[PDB]
Coordinates of N, CA and C in Angstrom, one line a residue:
Chain A
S8 N 123.0 85.4 188.1 CA 122.4 86.1 187.2 C 121.5 86.9 187.6
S9 N 120.5 87.1 186.5 CA 119.1 87.7 187.0 C 117.9 87.4 186.1
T10 N 117.0 87.1 186.3 CA 115.9 86.6 185.5 C 115.5 87.5 184.8
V11 N 115.3 87.4 183.2 CA 115.3 88.6 182.3 C 114.3 87.8 181.2
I12 N 113.6 88.4 181.1 CA 112.0 88.0 179.8 C 112.8 88.8 178.6
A13 N 113.6 89.5 177.9 CA 113.8 89.9 177.3 C 113.2 90.7 176.3
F14 N 113.0 90.9 175.0 CA 112.1 91.7 174.3 C 111.9 90.5 173.1
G15 N 112.9 89.8 172.2 CA 112.3 89.2 171.3 C 112.3 87.6 171.7
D16 N 111.9 87.4 173.2 CA 112.1 86.2 173.8 C 110.2 85.8 173.4
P17 N 109.9 84.4 173.3 CA 108.4 83.9 173.0 C 107.8 84.0 174.2
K18 N 108.5 84.4 175.4 CA 107.5 84.1 176.5 C 107.0 85.6 176.6
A19 N 107.7 86.8 176.2 CA 107.4 88.4 175.9 C 105.7 88.4 175.7
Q20 N 104.5 88.3 176.7 CA 103.3 88.3 175.9 C 103.0 89.9 174.9
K21 N 102.0 90.0 174.2 CA 101.5 90.8 173.5 C 100.2 91.1 173.2
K22 N 99.7 92.3 173.4 CA 98.3 92.4 173.3 C 98.0 93.4 172.4
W23 N 96.6 93.2 171.6 CA 96.3 93.7 170.4 C 95.0 94.3 170.7
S24 N 94.7 95.4 170.4 CA 93.8 96.4 170.2 C 92.6 96.0 169.7
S25 N 91.6 95.8 170.6 CA 90.1 95.6 169.7 C 89.2 96.9 168.8
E26 N 89.9 97.7 168.9 CA 89.0 99.1 168.4 C 90.1 99.6 167.1
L27 N 89.5 99.7 166.1 CA 89.9 100.0 164.5 C 90.0 101.5 164.7
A28 N 91.4 102.0 163.7 CA 90.9 103.2 163.4 C 90.5 103.3 161.6
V29 N 89.7 104.1 161.4 CA 89.0 104.1 160.4 C 89.3 105.3 159.7
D30 N 89.3 105.2 158.2 CA 89.3 106.5 157.3 C 87.8 107.0 157.2
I31 N 87.8 108.2 157.5 CA 86.2 108.8 157.9 C 85.9 109.0 156.5
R32 N 84.5 108.4 156.2 CA 84.0 108.9 154.6 C 84.4 110.2 154.3
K33 N 84.4 110.4 153.0 CA 84.7 111.8 152.6 C 83.0 112.3 152.5
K34 N 82.6 113.6 153.2 CA 81.9 114.2 153.1 C 81.2 114.3 151.8
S35 N 79.9 114.2 151.7 CA 79.3 113.9 150.2 C 78.7 115.3 150.1
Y36 N 78.8 116.1 149.0 CA 78.4 117.4 149.1 C 76.6 117.4 148.9
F37 N 76.5 116.4 147.9 CA 75.0 116.3 147.3 C 74.1 115.1 148.3
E38 N 73.9 115.8 149.3 CA 73.2 114.6 150.3 C 71.8 115.1 150.1
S39 N 70.8 114.4 151.1 CA 69.6 114.3 150.6 C 68.7 115.8 150.5
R40 N 69.1 116.5 150.9 CA 68.7 118.0 150.7 C 68.3 118.2 149.5
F41 N 69.5 118.0 148.7 CA 69.4 118.5 146.9 C 68.4 117.4 146.1
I42 N 68.7 116.1 146.0 CA 68.3 115.0 145.7 C 66.5 115.1 146.3
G43 N 65.5 115.6 145.7 CA 64.4 115.5 146.1 C 63.2 115.6 144.8
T44 N 62.3 115.1 144.9 CA 61.3 114.5 143.8 C 60.5 116.0 143.7
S45 N 60.6 116.9 144.4 CA 59.6 118.1 144.2 C 60.5 118.9 143.3
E46 N 59.7 119.9 142.7 CA 60.2 121.1 141.7 C 61.4 121.5 142.4
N47 N 61.3 122.1 143.6 CA 62.3 123.2 143.9 C 63.2 122.4 144.9
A48 N 64.2 121.4 144.1 CA 65.5 120.7 144.1 C 66.5 120.6 143.3
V49 N 67.7 120.5 144.0 CA 68.8 121.0 143.0 C 69.0 120.1 142.0
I50 N 68.6 118.7 142.2 CA 68.7 117.4 141.9 C 67.7 116.8 141.6
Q51 N 67.0 116.9 140.4 CA 65.8 116.3 140.6 C 65.6 114.8 140.3
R52 N 64.7 114.0 141.1 CA 65.0 112.6 140.7 C 63.3 112.5 139.7
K53 N 63.8 111.6 138.8 CA 62.6 110.9 137.7 C 62.3 109.6 138.4
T54 N 61.0 109.5 138.4 CA 60.2 108.5 139.3 C 59.6 107.1 138.4
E55 N 59.8 107.6 136.9 CA 59.1 106.8 136.1 C 59.5 105.3 135.9
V56 N 60.8 105.2 136.1 CA 61.2 103.6 135.6 C 61.2 103.1 137.2
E57 N 61.0 103.3 138.3 CA 61.0 102.6 139.6 C 60.5 101.4 139.6
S58 N 59.1 101.8 139.2 CA 57.9 100.6 138.9 C 57.7 100.0 138.0
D59 N 58.2 100.3 136.9 CA 57.9 100.1 135.5 C 59.0 99.5 134.9
Chain B
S18 N 142.9 157.2 215.2 CA 142.3 156.6 213.8 C 140.9 156.5 214.3
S19 N 140.3 155.5 213.8 CA 138.8 155.0 213.8 C 138.7 153.5 213.3
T20 N 137.9 152.9 214.5 CA 137.7 151.4 214.0 C 137.0 151.4 212.9
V21 N 137.6 150.9 211.7 CA 136.7 150.4 210.4 C 136.7 148.9 210.4
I22 N 135.5 148.4 210.5 CA 135.2 146.7 209.8 C 135.1 146.7 208.4
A23 N 136.1 146.7 207.8 CA 136.6 146.8 206.5 C 135.5 145.9 205.7
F24 N 135.4 145.6 204.3 CA 134.3 145.0 203.7 C 135.1 143.6 203.7
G25 N 136.2 143.3 203.8 CA 137.0 141.7 203.9 C 137.4 141.3 205.2
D26 N 137.0 141.8 206.2 CA 137.5 141.6 207.4 C 136.3 140.3 208.1
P27 N 137.2 139.6 208.6 CA 136.2 138.0 208.9 C 135.2 138.4 209.8
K28 N 135.3 139.5 210.8 CA 133.9 140.1 211.2 C 132.7 140.5 210.5
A29 N 132.9 140.7 209.5 CA 131.8 141.0 208.7 C 130.4 140.3 208.5
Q30 N 129.8 140.4 209.6 CA 128.6 139.0 209.5 C 127.7 139.3 208.0
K31 N 127.6 138.2 207.4 CA 126.4 137.6 206.7 C 125.2 136.9 207.1
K32 N 124.2 137.2 206.4 CA 122.6 136.6 207.1 C 122.0 135.6 205.9
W33 N 122.2 134.5 205.9 CA 121.8 133.8 204.4 C 120.2 133.7 204.8
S34 N 119.4 133.8 203.6 CA 118.1 133.8 203.7 C 117.5 132.4 203.8
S35 N 116.2 132.6 204.5 CA 115.5 131.1 204.2 C 115.1 130.6 203.4
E36 N 114.1 131.9 202.4 CA 113.5 131.6 201.1 C 114.6 131.1 200.3
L37 N 114.3 130.2 199.4 CA 115.0 129.9 198.3 C 114.3 130.2 197.1
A38 N 114.6 131.3 196.0 CA 113.9 131.2 194.5 C 114.3 130.0 194.2
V39 N 113.1 129.6 193.3 CA 113.0 128.6 192.3 C 112.8 129.0 191.0
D40 N 113.6 127.9 190.0 CA 113.5 128.2 188.4 C 111.5 128.0 188.4
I41 N 110.6 128.5 187.7 CA 109.6 128.0 187.5 C 109.4 126.9 186.4
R42 N 109.2 125.6 186.4 CA 109.1 124.3 185.6 C 108.2 124.9 184.4
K43 N 108.9 124.3 183.1 CA 108.2 124.3 181.9 C 106.8 123.8 181.8
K44 N 105.8 125.2 181.5 CA 104.2 124.3 181.3 C 104.2 123.7 180.2
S45 N 103.3 122.7 180.4 CA 103.5 121.8 179.6 C 101.9 121.5 178.8
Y46 N 102.4 121.6 177.5 CA 101.3 121.8 176.4 C 100.2 120.7 176.6
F47 N 100.9 119.4 176.7 CA 100.0 117.9 176.1 C 99.4 117.7 177.8
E48 N 98.4 118.5 178.2 CA 97.8 118.3 179.4 C 96.8 117.4 179.3
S49 N 95.8 117.6 180.3 CA 94.9 116.0 180.4 C 93.8 116.3 178.9
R50 N 93.7 117.8 178.4 CA 92.9 117.7 177.7 C 92.8 117.4 176.3
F51 N 93.9 116.9 175.9 CA 94.8 116.1 174.6 C 94.7 114.6 174.8
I52 N 95.6 114.6 175.9 CA 95.4 113.1 175.9 C 94.5 112.3 176.7
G53 N 93.5 111.8 175.9 CA 92.4 111.0 176.3 C 92.0 110.1 175.7
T54 N 91.1 108.9 176.3 CA 90.8 107.8 175.9 C 89.8 108.0 174.6
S55 N 89.3 107.2 173.6 CA 88.3 107.3 172.7 C 89.2 107.5 171.4
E56 N 88.0 107.8 170.2 CA 89.0 108.1 169.0 C 89.1 109.6 169.4
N57 N 88.2 110.1 169.8 CA 88.5 111.8 169.6 C 89.7 112.9 170.4
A58 N 90.4 112.1 170.8 CA 91.2 112.7 171.5 C 92.7 112.8 170.4
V59 N 93.7 114.1 170.3 CA 94.5 114.1 169.5 C 95.8 112.8 170.2
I60 N 96.1 112.6 171.4 CA 96.8 111.5 171.9 C 96.3 110.6 172.5
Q61 N 95.6 109.8 172.0 CA 95.0 108.5 172.5 C 95.6 107.4 173.3
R62 N 95.4 107.4 174.4 CA 96.2 106.5 175.1 C 95.5 104.9 175.2
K63 N 96.6 103.9 174.7 CA 96.0 102.4 174.6 C 95.7 101.9 175.9
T64 N 94.3 101.4 176.6 CA 94.2 101.1 177.9 C 94.4 99.4 177.9
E65 N 94.6 98.5 177.0 CA 94.6 97.4 176.5 C 96.2 96.6 178.0
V66 N 97.0 97.3 178.0 CA 98.4 97.1 178.4 C 98.1 97.5 179.7
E67 N 97.3 98.0 180.4 CA 97.3 98.7 181.6 C 97.5 97.9 182.7
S68 N 96.3 96.9 182.6 CA 96.0 96.1 183.3 C 96.8 94.5 183.6
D69 N 96.7 94.3 182.0 CA 97.1 92.8 181.6 C 98.9 92.8 181.7

């Protein structure tokens, strides 16, 4: 014969990839540019109930 | 008459050319520009199994 490690034999080593594929976060439109406590900001912040 | 060395006579010497025309190999789209490691390559290569 001739030595064969075959495919499904328990002696056939397998290696796992350490690095993960990820689903990139969906880019959020309302970033820090808009939400601002100043008047000239699309989404104003009310700071009344933060410390009270 | 006149000595005619006709087209089909065995004495009609030919001369084969040294230069050999060659088909140009198909250009490959997936050069090293795409095939690269890391996340940002269209066709990434897993380097885990290269040495182990």
